[PDB]
Amino acid sequence: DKAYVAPEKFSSKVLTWLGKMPLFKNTEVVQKHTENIRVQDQKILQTFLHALTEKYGETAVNDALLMSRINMNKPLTQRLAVQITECVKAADEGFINLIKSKDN
């Protein structure tokens, strides 16, 4: 189907469905289709499509895996936890400054 333009505005702006995009894998096939779409700035649309394509694939998928390796899914229930909300008041009142200075 072709790109369709909605009759009523959206957020005070004309709204247009650019139609289905061919599988991102076929870079040239995508470029072909894109050129046949009337837009104020062809290059911008092209770049946006490249960006959507790059979001996944190899480099991204790999950094995701490495992240998965480094990320030690430790249980929160077993971590040591201390509520330190009052430390801000301690600093503002000059309590922390007193404790630290007495160390020297």
């Binding site: 009759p7 702006k13 709204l15 650019l18 490249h50 790059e54």
Partner: protein, 130 residues
């Protein structure tokens, strides 16, 4: 995916256009004349992708820092994340929609997203890559 397609179709009738997801699980949109947006089906959530500006990978400390400071304001209001797509040398706004049980809610999320897109483009256009 059938569920995603039904939800996106319902939104299309509300907005007045045959919206649907393609083979890339994407639905490309154009607002006014220069705002490119995409609705993406991803497992249990939908991601809204927004073109901001093509940007130099070596734009300099001042520009990167400004964008990162802005990320602070955006995240505080859960409006989305400004991210850099390396090879494409593109700055994108990305925001996930975790609640897909309501058509009204989704549309509300989408309209706030495009307005945010517009505001950011106006703030960062001067840095756009010639």
């Amino acid at each position: 995916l059938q569920a995603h397609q039904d939800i996106i179709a319902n939104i299309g009738e509300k907005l007045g256009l045959p919206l649907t997801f393609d083979d890339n699980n994407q639905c490309l949109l154009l607002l006014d004349s220069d705002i490119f947006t995409s609705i993406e089906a991803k497992d249990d959530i939908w991601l809204l992708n927004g073109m901001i500006i093509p940007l130099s990978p070596v734009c300099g400390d001042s520009i990167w820092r400004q964008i990162m400071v802005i990320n602070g304001e955006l995240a505080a209001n859960n409006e989305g994340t400004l991210a850099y797509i390396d090879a494409a040398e593109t700055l994108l706004l990305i925001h996930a929609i975790t609640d897909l049980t309501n058509t009204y809610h989704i549309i509300s999320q989408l309209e706030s997203f495009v307005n945010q897109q517009e505001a950011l483009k106006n703030i960062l256009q001067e840095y756009a890559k010639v």
